[PDB]
Amino acid sequence: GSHMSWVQLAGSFKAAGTSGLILKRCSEPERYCLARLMADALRGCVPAFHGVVERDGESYLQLQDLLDGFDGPCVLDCKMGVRTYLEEELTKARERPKLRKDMYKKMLAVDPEAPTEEEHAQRAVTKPRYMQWREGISSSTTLGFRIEGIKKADGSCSTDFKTTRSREQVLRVFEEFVQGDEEVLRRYLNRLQQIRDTLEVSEFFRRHEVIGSSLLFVHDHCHRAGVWLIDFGKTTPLPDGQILDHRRPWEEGNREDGYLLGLDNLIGILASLAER
Ligand SMILES: Nc1ncnc2c1ncn2[C@@H]1O[C@H](COP(=O)(O)OP(=O)(O)OP(=O)(O)O)[C@@H](O)[C@H]1O
Ligand SMILES: O=P(O)(O)O[C@@H]1[C@H](O)[C@@H](O)[C@@H](OP(=O)(O)O)[C@H](OP(=O)(O)O)[C@H]1O
Ligand SMILES: [Mn+2]
Protein backbone atom coordinates (compact mmCIF):
# COMPACT_ATOMS: atom_id res chain seq x y z
CA GLY A 1 0.00 0.00 0.00
CA SER A 2 2.15 2.93 1.29
CA HIS A 3 5.55 3.47 3.02
CA MET A 4 4.04 6.00 5.55
CA SER A 5 1.54 3.22 6.62
CA TRP A 6 4.68 1.12 7.47
CA VAL A 7 6.38 4.13 9.22
CA GLN A 8 3.14 4.51 11.35
CA LEU A 9 2.78 0.75 12.24
CA ALA A 10 6.59 0.62 12.96
CA GLY A 11 11.75 10.38 9.86
CA SER A 12 13.34 11.75 6.60
CA PHE A 13 9.94 10.93 4.92
CA LYS A 14 6.50 12.60 5.25
CA ALA A 15 2.93 11.68 4.12
CA ALA A 16 2.06 13.43 0.78
CA GLY A 17 -1.32 15.14 0.09
CA THR A 18 -1.77 13.20 -3.20
CA SER A 19 -2.68 9.46 -3.34
CA GLY A 20 0.30 7.21 -4.31
CA LEU A 21 2.96 9.88 -3.49
CA ILE A 22 5.49 10.23 -0.63
CA LEU A 23 7.67 13.22 0.43
CA LYS A 24 11.44 12.93 1.07
CA ARG A 25 13.49 15.82 2.63
CA CYS A 26 15.09 17.70 -0.36
CA SER A 27 18.93 17.57 -0.74
CA GLU A 28 20.58 19.42 -3.69
CA PRO A 29 22.54 16.37 -5.00
CA GLU A 30 19.37 14.14 -4.92
CA ARG A 31 17.06 16.80 -6.47
CA TYR A 32 19.62 17.37 -9.32
CA CYS A 33 19.86 13.55 -9.88
CA LEU A 34 16.08 12.83 -9.98
CA ALA A 35 15.54 15.73 -12.44
CA ARG A 36 18.24 14.29 -14.84
CA LEU A 37 16.88 10.72 -14.28
CA MET A 38 13.30 11.63 -15.48
CA ALA A 39 14.94 12.48 -18.91
CA ASP A 40 17.35 9.48 -18.92
CA ALA A 41 17.18 5.83 -20.11
CA LEU A 42 16.87 5.03 -16.31
CA ARG A 43 13.50 6.89 -16.07
CA GLY A 44 11.54 3.61 -15.54
CA CYS A 45 14.11 2.19 -13.04
CA VAL A 46 13.64 4.97 -10.39
CA PRO A 47 10.65 6.44 -8.54
CA ALA A 48 8.77 9.11 -10.53
CA PHE A 49 9.89 12.62 -9.38
CA HIS A 50 7.11 15.29 -9.59
CA GLY A 51 9.12 18.27 -8.21
CA VAL A 52 9.62 19.99 -4.82
CA VAL A 53 6.92 21.13 -2.30
CA GLU A 54 7.19 23.23 0.94
CA ARG A 55 5.71 21.64 4.14
CA ASP A 56 6.10 23.49 7.51
CA GLY A 57 8.59 25.88 5.78
CA GLU A 58 10.69 22.88 4.56
CA SER A 59 11.69 21.55 1.06
CA TYR A 60 10.46 18.00 0.07
CA LEU A 61 10.88 15.89 -3.11
CA GLN A 62 7.42 14.67 -4.26
CA LEU A 63 8.09 10.98 -5.17
CA GLN A 64 6.13 7.99 -6.37
CA ASP A 65 5.36 5.73 -3.39
CA LEU A 66 6.81 2.46 -4.78
CA LEU A 67 4.59 0.37 -2.36
CA ASP A 68 1.28 1.81 -3.81
CA GLY A 69 0.76 -1.05 -6.37
CA PHE A 70 1.23 -3.87 -3.77
CA ASP A 71 -1.12 -5.62 -1.28
CA GLY A 72 0.87 -5.87 2.03
CA PRO A 73 4.36 -5.53 0.48
CA CYS A 74 7.62 -7.23 1.64
CA VAL A 75 10.62 -4.84 1.04
CA LEU A 76 14.39 -5.58 0.91
CA ASP A 77 16.93 -2.70 0.65
CA CYS A 78 20.27 -3.60 -1.00
CA LYS A 79 23.08 -0.93 -0.69
CA MET A 80 24.99 -1.00 -4.02
CA GLY A 81 28.76 -0.51 -4.56
CA VAL A 82 32.16 -1.72 -3.30
CA ARG A 83 32.61 1.82 -1.84
CA THR A 84 29.90 3.54 0.31
CA TYR A 85 31.49 7.01 0.90
CA LEU A 86 32.70 9.83 -1.43
CA GLU A 87 36.49 10.33 -2.04
CA GLU A 88 36.14 13.92 -0.65
CA GLU A 89 35.42 12.29 2.78
CA LEU A 90 39.01 10.84 2.71
CA THR A 91 40.39 14.40 2.09
CA LYS A 92 38.35 15.90 5.01
CA ALA A 93 39.39 13.06 7.41
CA ARG A 94 43.09 13.77 6.57
CA GLU A 95 43.03 17.60 6.76
CA ARG A 96 40.28 18.09 9.40
CA PRO A 97 38.88 14.83 10.85
CA LYS A 98 35.43 14.81 12.53
CA LEU A 99 35.94 12.14 15.24
CA ARG A 100 32.57 10.26 15.30
CA LYS A 101 32.05 8.67 18.79
CA ASP A 102 28.76 6.95 17.65
CA MET A 103 30.63 4.98 14.92
CA TYR A 104 33.25 3.85 17.56
CA LYS A 105 30.50 2.20 19.73
CA LYS A 106 28.93 -0.01 16.98
CA MET A 107 32.41 -1.09 15.81
CA LEU A 108 33.39 -2.17 19.38
CA ALA A 109 29.99 -3.99 19.68
CA VAL A 110 30.67 -6.09 16.49
CA ASP A 111 34.49 -6.57 16.96
CA PRO A 112 36.39 -5.54 20.14
CA GLU A 113 39.86 -5.94 18.40
CA ALA A 114 38.72 -3.87 15.32
CA PRO A 115 39.52 -0.31 16.59
CA THR A 116 43.23 0.73 16.85
CA GLU A 117 44.96 1.51 20.21
CA GLU A 118 44.52 5.24 19.20
CA GLU A 119 40.83 4.85 18.21
CA HIS A 120 40.23 3.19 21.67
CA ALA A 121 42.10 6.15 23.32
CA GLN A 122 39.94 8.63 21.24
CA ARG A 123 36.79 6.46 21.86
CA ALA A 124 36.12 7.63 18.23
CA VAL A 125 36.79 6.98 14.48
CA THR A 126 36.58 8.93 11.16
CA LYS A 127 33.56 8.25 8.83
CA PRO A 128 35.72 6.71 6.01
CA ARG A 129 37.34 4.32 8.54
CA TYR A 130 33.91 3.26 9.96
CA MET A 131 32.49 2.94 6.38
CA GLN A 132 35.54 0.84 5.19
CA TRP A 133 35.26 -1.51 8.19
CA ARG A 134 31.43 -1.95 7.53
CA GLU A 135 32.28 -2.75 3.86
CA GLY A 136 34.75 -5.53 4.89
CA ILE A 137 32.61 -7.41 7.48
CA SER A 138 29.59 -7.30 5.08
CA SER A 139 29.50 -8.37 1.39
CA SER A 140 30.22 -4.80 0.14
CA THR A 141 34.02 -5.17 -0.40
CA THR A 142 33.96 -8.67 -2.05
CA LEU A 143 30.52 -8.76 -3.89
CA GLY A 144 29.90 -4.97 -4.36
CA PHE A 145 26.53 -4.87 -2.55
CA ARG A 146 25.07 -5.60 0.90
CA ILE A 147 21.64 -6.32 2.34
CA GLU A 148 20.66 -3.41 4.67
CA GLY A 149 17.13 -4.37 5.79
CA ILE A 150 13.84 -6.21 5.27
CA LYS A 151 10.43 -4.63 6.12
CA LYS A 152 6.92 -6.19 6.00
CA ALA A 153 3.57 -4.35 5.87
CA ASP A 154 2.61 -5.41 9.52
CA GLY A 155 5.40 -3.06 10.81
CA SER A 156 7.88 -6.04 11.17
CA CYS A 157 11.53 -5.19 10.26
CA SER A 158 15.13 -6.49 10.47
CA THR A 159 18.42 -4.60 9.95
CA ASP A 160 20.42 -7.48 11.53
CA PHE A 161 22.70 -8.01 8.45
CA LYS A 162 26.04 -6.25 9.32
CA THR A 163 28.02 -9.61 9.20
CA THR A 164 26.17 -11.09 6.15
CA ARG A 165 29.23 -11.44 3.88
CA SER A 166 29.55 -14.81 2.02
CA ARG A 167 27.77 -15.52 -1.30
CA GLU A 168 25.80 -18.36 0.39
CA GLN A 169 24.85 -16.17 3.47
CA VAL A 170 23.40 -13.54 1.05
CA LEU A 171 21.59 -16.27 -0.94
CA ARG A 172 19.96 -17.56 2.34
CA VAL A 173 18.58 -14.05 3.12
CA PHE A 174 16.98 -13.84 -0.42
CA GLU A 175 15.74 -17.47 -0.03
CA GLU A 176 13.94 -16.50 3.25
CA PHE A 177 12.72 -13.15 1.74
CA VAL A 178 10.96 -14.75 -1.32
CA GLN A 179 9.68 -17.77 0.78
CA GLY A 180 9.61 -20.23 -2.21
CA ASP A 181 7.56 -17.88 -4.52
CA GLU A 182 9.07 -18.99 -7.92
CA GLU A 183 7.05 -16.25 -9.77
CA VAL A 184 8.36 -13.38 -7.55
CA LEU A 185 11.94 -14.69 -7.97
CA ARG A 186 11.54 -15.00 -11.79
CA ARG A 187 10.06 -11.44 -11.94
CA TYR A 188 12.94 -10.08 -9.78
CA LEU A 189 15.54 -11.67 -12.12
CA ASN A 190 13.78 -10.38 -15.28
CA ARG A 191 13.68 -6.86 -13.73
CA LEU A 192 17.38 -6.96 -12.69
CA GLN A 193 18.48 -8.16 -16.20
CA GLN A 194 16.48 -5.22 -17.77
CA ILE A 195 17.95 -2.76 -15.17
CA ARG A 196 21.53 -3.95 -15.96
CA ASP A 197 20.83 -3.38 -19.73
CA THR A 198 19.48 0.16 -18.98
CA LEU A 199 22.46 1.08 -16.73
CA GLU A 200 24.97 -0.10 -19.40
CA VAL A 201 23.53 2.40 -22.00
CA SER A 202 22.52 5.20 -19.51
CA GLU A 203 24.10 8.64 -20.25
CA PHE A 204 23.46 9.61 -16.58
CA PHE A 205 25.13 6.38 -15.27
CA ARG A 206 28.41 6.65 -17.32
CA ARG A 207 28.76 10.37 -16.21
CA HIS A 208 28.09 9.87 -12.43
CA GLU A 209 29.70 8.26 -9.40
CA VAL A 210 26.82 6.38 -7.70
CA ILE A 211 27.61 6.03 -3.96
CA GLY A 212 25.19 5.17 -1.12
CA SER A 213 22.25 4.26 -3.49
CA SER A 214 20.10 1.13 -3.04
CA LEU A 215 18.06 -1.35 -5.05
CA LEU A 216 14.64 -1.66 -3.41
CA PHE A 217 13.00 -5.09 -3.97
CA VAL A 218 9.18 -5.07 -3.37
CA HIS A 219 6.80 -8.08 -3.62
CA ASP A 220 3.39 -9.20 -2.30
CA HIS A 221 1.39 -12.45 -1.82
CA CYS A 222 -0.36 -11.82 -5.24
CA HIS A 223 3.17 -12.41 -6.76
CA ARG A 224 3.58 -8.72 -7.85
CA ALA A 225 7.35 -7.89 -7.85
CA GLY A 226 9.28 -4.69 -8.66
CA VAL A 227 12.82 -3.37 -8.23
CA TRP A 228 13.87 0.30 -8.30
CA LEU A 229 17.08 2.29 -7.72
CA ILE A 230 16.65 4.79 -4.86
CA ASP A 231 18.69 7.31 -2.82
CA PHE A 232 20.75 9.67 -5.04
CA GLY A 233 21.92 11.76 -2.01
CA LYS A 234 25.60 10.85 -2.74
CA THR A 235 25.47 10.48 -6.56
CA THR A 236 27.86 13.12 -8.06
CA PRO A 237 28.66 14.10 -11.67
CA LEU A 238 32.23 13.40 -12.95
CA PRO A 239 34.26 16.44 -14.12
CA ASP A 240 35.08 17.54 -17.74
CA GLY A 241 33.12 14.69 -19.46
CA GLN A 242 35.08 11.89 -17.64
CA ILE A 243 33.23 8.48 -17.47
CA LEU A 244 33.27 5.33 -15.25
CA ASP A 245 32.96 1.61 -16.28
CA HIS A 246 31.44 0.79 -12.78
CA ARG A 247 33.18 -2.66 -12.72
CA ARG A 248 36.93 -1.98 -12.25
CA PRO A 249 38.42 -1.80 -8.71
CA TRP A 250 38.33 1.48 -6.70
CA GLU A 251 41.71 3.29 -6.22
CA GLU A 252 41.55 6.83 -4.71
CA GLY A 253 41.49 9.30 -7.66
CA ASN A 254 39.62 6.99 -10.14
CA ARG A 255 36.12 7.54 -8.48
CA GLU A 256 35.06 3.94 -9.42
CA ASP A 257 32.08 2.63 -7.30
CA GLY A 258 31.94 -1.06 -8.47
CA TYR A 259 28.13 -0.58 -8.95
CA LEU A 260 27.87 -3.12 -11.84
CA LEU A 261 30.23 -5.58 -10.11
CA GLY A 262 27.52 -5.61 -7.38
CA LEU A 263 24.65 -5.96 -9.84
CA ASP A 264 26.47 -8.79 -11.77
CA ASN A 265 27.01 -10.65 -8.44
CA LEU A 266 23.44 -9.95 -7.28
CA ILE A 267 22.00 -11.35 -10.58
CA GLY A 268 24.28 -14.48 -10.26
CA ILE A 269 23.04 -15.19 -6.69
CA LEU A 270 19.35 -14.83 -7.69
CA ALA A 271 19.90 -17.05 -10.81
CA SER A 272 21.65 -19.60 -8.45
CA LEU A 273 18.71 -19.43 -5.99
CA ALA A 274 16.24 -20.00 -8.90
CA GLU A 275 18.02 -23.34 -9.78
CA ARG A 276 17.85 -24.65 -6.11
N1 LIG B 1 9.96 6.26 -3.37
C1 LIG B 1 9.84 5.42 -2.35
N2 LIG B 1 8.69 4.73 -2.19
C2 LIG B 1 8.55 3.92 -1.14
N3 LIG B 1 9.42 3.67 -0.16
C3 LIG B 1 10.54 4.38 -0.33
C4 LIG B 1 10.83 5.25 -1.36
N4 LIG B 1 12.07 5.81 -1.18
C5 LIG B 1 12.52 5.28 -0.07
N5 LIG B 1 11.64 4.38 0.49
C6 LIG B 1 11.78 3.64 1.77
O1 LIG B 1 12.59 4.40 2.64
C7 LIG B 1 13.83 3.71 2.93
C8 LIG B 1 14.95 4.72 3.01
O2 LIG B 1 15.17 5.31 1.71
P1 LIG B 1 16.46 6.18 1.32
O3 LIG B 1 17.66 5.32 1.38
O4 LIG B 1 16.16 6.92 0.06
O5 LIG B 1 16.51 7.29 2.47
P2 LIG B 1 17.65 7.85 3.45
O6 LIG B 1 16.90 8.76 4.36
O7 LIG B 1 18.81 8.40 2.66
O8 LIG B 1 18.10 6.51 4.18
P3 LIG B 1 19.56 5.84 4.43
O9 LIG B 1 20.38 6.82 5.30
O10 LIG B 1 19.22 4.57 5.15
O11 LIG B 1 20.20 5.58 3.09
C9 LIG B 1 13.92 2.69 1.79
O12 LIG B 1 14.79 1.62 2.13
C10 LIG B 1 12.46 2.27 1.65
O13 LIG B 1 12.02 1.36 2.64
O1 LIG C 1 24.29 2.09 8.25
P1 LIG C 1 25.29 2.40 9.35
O2 LIG C 1 26.30 1.29 9.53
O3 LIG C 1 24.62 2.82 10.64
O4 LIG C 1 25.92 3.78 8.82
C1 LIG C 1 25.21 4.87 8.19
C2 LIG C 1 24.95 4.48 6.74
O5 LIG C 1 26.15 4.04 6.10
C3 LIG C 1 24.33 5.64 5.97
O6 LIG C 1 23.06 6.00 6.50
C4 LIG C 1 25.26 6.82 6.09
O7 LIG C 1 24.67 7.93 5.40
P2 LIG C 1 25.24 8.37 3.97
O8 LIG C 1 26.73 8.54 4.18
O9 LIG C 1 24.56 9.66 3.54
O10 LIG C 1 24.91 7.15 3.14
C5 LIG C 1 25.42 7.23 7.54
O11 LIG C 1 26.29 8.37 7.59
P3 LIG C 1 26.18 9.58 8.67
O12 LIG C 1 24.93 10.34 8.29
O13 LIG C 1 26.04 8.76 9.93
O14 LIG C 1 27.44 10.42 8.59
C6 LIG C 1 26.06 6.12 8.33
O15 LIG C 1 26.15 6.55 9.68
MN1 LIG D 1 20.96 7.88 2.08
Residue numbers in the entry: 183 to 192, 196 to 461
Sentences from the paper on this structure:
InsP3 3-kinase, a highly specific enzyme binding InsP3 in just one mode, phosphorylates InsP3 specifically at its secondary 3-hydroxyl group to generate a tetrakisphosphate. However, they present a third lobe, the IP-lobe inserted into the C-lobe, which accounts for most of the interactions with the inositide substrate. Summarizing, IP3K substrate recognition entails close interactions with the three phosphates in positions 1, 4 and 5 of the InsP or of the corresponding carbohydrate-based analogues.
We observed that this depends on the nature of the substituent at pseudo 2-position of the inositol ring. All InsP3 (or InsP4) isomers (compounds 1–4) retain the ability to stabilize the enzyme significantly. Finally, the presence of two axial -OH groups (4-s) constitutes the least stabilizing isomers in this group.
